[PDB]
Enzyme design. Structure first.
Site, PDB file in Angstrom:
ATOM      1  N   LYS D 186       0.884  -1.150   0.000  1.00 20.30           N
ATOM      2  CA  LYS D 186       0.000   0.000   0.000  1.00 20.30           C
ATOM      3  C   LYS D 186       0.929   1.209   0.000  1.00 20.30           C
ATOM      4  O   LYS D 186       1.751   1.370   0.906  1.00 20.30           O
ATOM      5  CB  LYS D 186      -0.856   0.011   1.268  1.00 20.30           C
ATOM      6  CG  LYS D 186      -2.271   0.522   1.078  1.00 20.30           C
ATOM      7  CD  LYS D 186      -2.326   1.992   0.701  1.00 20.30           C
ATOM      8  CE  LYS D 186      -2.072   2.892   1.893  1.00 20.30           C
ATOM      9  NZ  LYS D 186      -2.178   4.327   1.496  1.00 20.30           N
ATOM     10  N   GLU D 262       7.987   1.231  11.993  1.00 18.96           N
ATOM     11  CA  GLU D 262       9.018   2.253  11.877  1.00 18.96           C
ATOM     12  C   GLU D 262       8.189   3.535  11.963  1.00 18.96           C
ATOM     13  O   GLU D 262       7.575   3.967  10.985  1.00 18.96           O
ATOM     14  CB  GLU D 262       9.749   2.140  10.533  1.00 18.96           C
ATOM     15  CG  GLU D 262      11.084   2.889  10.466  1.00 18.96           C
ATOM     16  CD  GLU D 262      10.954   4.396  10.660  1.00 18.96           C
ATOM     17  OE1 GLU D 262      10.631   5.106   9.684  1.00 18.96           O
ATOM     18  OE2 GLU D 262      11.180   4.874  11.790  1.00 18.96           O
TER      19      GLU D 262
END
Ligand code: NA
Ligand code: NA
Ligand code: NA
Ligand code: NA
Lengths: 494, 494, 494, 494
Positions: D186, D262
């Site tokens: 995505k 992250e």
């Protein structure tokens, strides 16, 4: 070679362990722990809750501060401490084995020769890892010196089940302490006693206060507090797949703590037509019935090739009928009682479920004794993939034997599950062994054996049987936080 | 689909390669390199000696100086250079394959599909290692920060054989360059051409001058100079066990340079009675006859269980008799000529010894053509362990078939050798396979296959077949010099 | 806190150790071992020769046979035995430390606090490695399952020096036993006692007979027999660079056994002008004078930046003048006698040579006592690179101080040596430290410290200081023989 | 040497990529992507939703089936493909750098020399890992042969941000593809173009259909669909800490898929008084202003030692005032516009808050152009820890400068945060560097540099800046599923 047991060991620890000292719950509440063989209360234990968890986490955080004794301590010395803890556990081996049986129900001979042996091997193995999990020096581009520090992850919340009280405690403490972390451990309400006695040994071994804190109590309270705690850096949970989902959700809702799970399964034990019949029958029995069937990786789906099905079933039924059920302190006893009443009833329900589904009841199927939680070794034949007893973890002495024709077929059926903790293959053919061991979607694939655990070999599940691995070098990854240090240098050279 | 070859490829390089330039020998002497299929001279080649080796070492030492382009270059860039060399080799694939065949004698199809494919895979595999062979950060006792630097060993002397000219060059250049070393290479006088052309591709790839230096010539001169050089840090030699001893002594007598050796063998290929006959027969044939039988790990001792011996031998003889010998550039040819007259005569001598000692000649046994060093595919049956052909490396198309009864017997007989380079086991049984792979004292044990080389898997010998390993991650060990750096720090913490 | 020593410890072992039994030399010959502090003979020791080495090798080979107790033993149990050995050595710490001092001459306090402490840490470190040196499963091309077995190299010949009798024995047995090898050890004629007593503890610990065999005797006899033996698979040697060459030549001339060497040096200790004066002066003193200067990595070339030269030399002389020389059993003694008469005289010869070639004698220079082999702490100023004392290993209490101006300059002068065992850098600047640690061609580069050894960090030399590394994970490489097992599988998948 | 850019590059891909084919969203809906430099629409892109994600997951699952071309493919070939993909990206480097700048806003010179260079380096680095991430052969107790297979985790859902479109795609694909996984990616709605074009190159490179699937769309729809999918085995999410929590909750609520995050940060850049003034000023400027301040590890907390504060600030202000803001395609431009209007406004809101809370506005503080999302380089002095602009991630060209006195002080203030992604230390002192790099609780600590990324060095955050590591060998851990295979053998030997 087992020393006579004290069938009524004295209990010395039944409180909350924080900063190497014993404490009552803030609420002063206590819960009774029961002897499954008699259904009688052994003693009362402090009921830890959120406020008690908070105290433990604070002690652990304090012990993890930069410059503290635990942080400055040589990695090799952490190794010395684990080896000392192992020696103390060995000194009190006979006592711990007896206490393990009294609170859990498993046969004393097994507690002594298996459970405690593996606890010692686990701690001694990890003690050796303390000063050998190296970081790296990296050949980065440019005029730089780059390297990684393998630092402890920090405050680790560890939640362990009741099937293997001492062993599960060792699997958790070994890797965490070897890597310099601090612990807040929640033991099972059904079996808190042995873990609390080990805490006494932890202090005796010389571990700084706050390095290991143990909080007995229940899951929705004590366990949930650890999982949702804002200052717990990592959590390790071993238990049901259902609670595992709760734990990960809690972690994601709090501080994004690192999570590893060791959940249940519905492990397939595949018996090819060329396998050694006598060995396969005994290993299939062990694979399922071991520890009163209360094993996460139990071979609960015994697939047997059609050509040897009839004989295999006949021998399995005979083995199940001869399996001695009784007082775990009696040497003749092979199977003790289930852990508690909740499990006892849950198993009786699954047994009735199998009968309703049309699974052929070959033996057992009922209560084995009036006192305690004893269930007769039960065997179901002609089990089908779509049956509930073929899909859901029973966690009791209830065996499912299914029939199959081809090797390609069995692979598809074995893998058609949300679980993927373990699997086994019994064959004399080299190619079939490699074909199957590669094809099976499971954490551990045993070939011509079962329940072979080594402190040096990783264990963990695929799919919804869990995430992450315990034991081996791999068991240290989840207890390590990696730090990259990149330093500008005058002129980098190879 | 093999592209049509140029059966008479032009020679562009035949001099000494130093600092990316072509030089004649200081003496200006040249030696001829012959086409083994015709016995005719291909061209003259610069005959390097001590003084030429001295020039190459100085060039390499200069290229290894701290602050040089090769020393300062990012590890990742070395990999780019290695991949670039591979791309250049792939571009000139048909040419190098034809040149390999012309100078060596092996079938053009094999040089193309096998040798060159393996050269490309080896070089590309090591290109990826260039920036991944990390050093370590070590948790030493006290207030210190200790780590290791994996530095290049330095000036590497590499002496390669004639059986796989381009491939042996790749096995040496790959690990050496991947780890930032500089090279002074001595190629075989029987096959110097292809390697010299690669030296030209090394220059085109952009490798800094002096990084790779090739000195064609003889062993007692050029090779010995390398082994005894006071400025060569490490030597890697592939050849006979006899010369390997000369190399280690020279290293000890000179500057104590690091040594690794890939020597000969008398590899046993064990066929159990339950093995797949068709596969076992075809693989046993390949195992010995591959590359004119000029393979260090050739299955020169074919042990066959008595129950299948007669049939195995029958099929083996038929397969050997159908083996097409002829012009290597002919697509029908399975077997080309031997490398030279010396080898040609050695093999005929061994065949003679086989006849004298009572080994049963089943087929072949002599010259296969009136021109060229062609030898008939030979098969000896009923060979005994004490026979010369059962002990010494023949390095030719000479198959030895031995009969055995038990598995215990064959292990002792297979291991009763000073060699221990490789071995194989053909069986369908899991236990036998594992029993044998463990018991066999060999660097590589193939199960149900033979001569399966992977750039990822290490290769090397046990006992007198050599020391150290080539290929895989292990292949980097001999080319790395470890430096420990221990720094005093204010206060160490985990 | 050191326990009072027994200044005249009884000797219990003085024979050859084979198969856990004590034997007289075949020739019945014995040799005297002397107390370097008095010059008096301690006791007689069996003088082993080739015939005795042969007996030891056969015992080692027998213990190494497949299926033997040592070969079948679980890797983890090998760790258990190594830890048991450490426990036995710790039990007899005071005795072993006194016996070490009696035979070697080093201060008892150092034997107890340093030597034995390190022996214990080495053995315990490697005990943890026993079951953690994993082989690999390799993703090779094609339908194959390839993996490597890390097997023991076999019968290991180990020759250790007299400077650190017990410690050198631990550095050898630790990695060898952890990886499952068998040993034939040759101890120094000057210090055979402690190693022989340890052999008694190896028997007590439970190691199978033949796993460790110790043969005391001379170098040209026992040592050479080991180096040239046809059944010794690997030889590890620690000593002079001179004998190192003899060992490698012997290996190449015999069975091509694997070789690793730990030789001498002339390690440069660089003091930059921004260094902590007090710290650098004390560490430079320790760097050279430690263990009567009898250390392979002694900082025998003290380079001092011109701006701080005068003050450094001033402080160094004051420190050398106040260094207490005397009876090693007295708690005040910092320096005991040299090991023997040969060394005593050799060191005096170097001092004379230093004075002859123009080095400025700043203190000491002569005999320190009429009895024993005591030498005054000697310091030489204004030493130049070309001076004998600036190039040759003295192995005594003789310090060399040289002056330098630039950082580029000192790197070249430090690296201008055939040795490269170790080096050091004293500076407060980050860049200077990184610049120097990278550029220095030494196996170990210490920054703001010296002689910091850790069982976790590798030690070994560059150039002629040796080959291979001891300690750390690297210490296991030379004791492992790699075997590749490549199995054909039906269909390989990732 | 930057090639002239096409300031208005054409768009060739704007759909959903499934099975190497271009599809419109099931709903047929599209969304506009804007050129931040002009605020104008570039083109319409297919708006992927749950149904589109379901199609992608199905395609990926199919390509992951045992026996498929992707599963059977040699590990080395996966590396060949990654390298080929890299070569294609390099071929279209000029075009991609321009398209990147058009959709993102970063300066073309930067897109070309930095982003694409790093993209190529990341893919080429991981191409080398494909066949080198070995499993292990384990020396387990008893008569067993235990080993581990490093298998791919399976179907991986990857969600990347808009700050480094091409680079983030590479960081995700490199490790996943190298390990044999299949991907459902995505991309950010703000920058989907370049990633989509790369999908074309993925097909051109030869990757089997379904191995890589790209679904452009929105986060609450497509993103949540991936995180919640019952058949996605692993998710890696890069973005805000806020969404990160949603991702981990979604994973735990669904199928317990493996997760790595992250997230953001508020990284401290510590300037000690002994630092190189000029270097620290330029690096601190780069540390915050790089990529329009839109970097996760931006040194948004610049700590300056009081003694050099005034001078540092002065030079910093002068540097910020000279920073050229303008058309990203203009070679003179240093800072382009912010990604979109939302960010544009959010940054202005933070600048307003900074002024409201007492921070001293030194330069900038407003809009830099009447068209596009340009903001002036802003510097705030005398910032306090409690200030909102010193706690919250602004992700824009707003610099915060704090004053401090001691090293213990800065450590605590730097660590007093919920973030822990990165940190920097500028000092010439060795001890200061080592003290700080150890004490700072951040994933990466740069010494005398900033934003130094290497494909070989891991990157990830501590605390709430994420979990797990990307890049280097560590980046492979999260894409591997470990399987233990324990085989019963006749008799285990070392
Ligand atoms: Na079973
Ligand atoms: Na030739
Ligand atoms: Na041959
Ligand atoms: Na002596």
């Amino acid at each position: 070679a087992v020393p006579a047991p004290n069938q009524q060991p004295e209990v010395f620890c039944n409180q909350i362990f924080i900063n190497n000292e014993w404490h009552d719950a803030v609420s002063r509440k206590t819960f009774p722990t029961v002897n499954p063989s008699t259904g009688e209360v052994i003693c009362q234990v402090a009921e830890g809750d959120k406020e008690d968890v908070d105290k433990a986490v604070k002690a652990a955080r304090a012990a993890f501060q930069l410059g503290s004794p635990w942080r400055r301590m040589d990695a090799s010395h952490r190794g010395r401490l684990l080896n000392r803890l192992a020696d103390l556990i060995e000194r009190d081996r006979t006592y711990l084995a007896a206490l393990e049986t009294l609170d859990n129900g498993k046969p004393y001979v097994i507690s002594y020769l298996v459970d405690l042996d593996m606890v010692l091997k686990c701690l001694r193995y990890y003690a050796g890892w303390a000063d050998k999990y190296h970081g790296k020096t990296i050949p980065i581009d440019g005029d730089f010196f780059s390297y990684t520090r393998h630092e402890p992850v920090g405050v680790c919340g560890q939640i362990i089940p009741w099937n293997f009280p001492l062993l599960m405690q060792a699997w958790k403490l070994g890797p965490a302490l070897a890597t310099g972390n601090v612990v807040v451990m929640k033991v099972a309400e059904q079996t808190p006693l042995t873990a609390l006695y080990v805490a006494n040994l932890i202090k005796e071994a010389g571990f700084p206060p706050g390095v290991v804190n143990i909080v007995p109590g229940f899951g929705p309270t004590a366990g949930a507090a650890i999982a949702s705690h804002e200052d717990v850096d990592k959590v390790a949970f071993t238990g049901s797949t259902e609670i595992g989902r709760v734990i990960q959700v809690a972690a994601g809702s709090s501080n994004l703590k690192r999570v590893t799970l060791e959940l249940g399964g519905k492990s397939p034990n595949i018996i090819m037509s060329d396998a050694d019949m006598d060995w396969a029958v005994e290993q299939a029995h062990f694979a399922l019935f071991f520890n009163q069937g209360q094993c996460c990786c139990a071979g609960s789906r015994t697939f047997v090739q059609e050509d040897i099905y009839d004989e295999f079933v006949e021998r399995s039924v005979a083995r199940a009928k001869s399996r001695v059920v009784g007082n775990p302190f009696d040497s003749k006893t092979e199977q003790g009682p289930q852990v508690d009443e909740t499990q006892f009833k849950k198993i009786l329900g699954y047994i009735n479920t199998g009968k309703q589904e049309g699974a052929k009841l070959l033996c057992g199927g009922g209560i084995a004794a009036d006192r305690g939680y004893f269930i007769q070794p039960t065997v179901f034949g002609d089990v089908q993939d779509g049956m509930t007893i073929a899909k859901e973890e029973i966690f009791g002495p209830v065996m499912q034997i299914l029939k199959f024709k081809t090797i390609e077929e069995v692979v598809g059926r074995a893998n058609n599950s949300t679980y993927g903790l373990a699997a086994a293959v019994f064959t004399k053919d080299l190619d079939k062994a490699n074909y199957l061991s590669q094809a099976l979607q499971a954490g551990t694939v045993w070939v011509n054996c079962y329940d072979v655990f080594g402190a040096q070999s990783p264990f963990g599940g695929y799919k919804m049987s869990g995430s992450g691995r315990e034991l081996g070098e791999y068991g240290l990854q989840a207890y390590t936080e990696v730090k990259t240090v990149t330093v500008k240098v005058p002129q980098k050279n190879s």
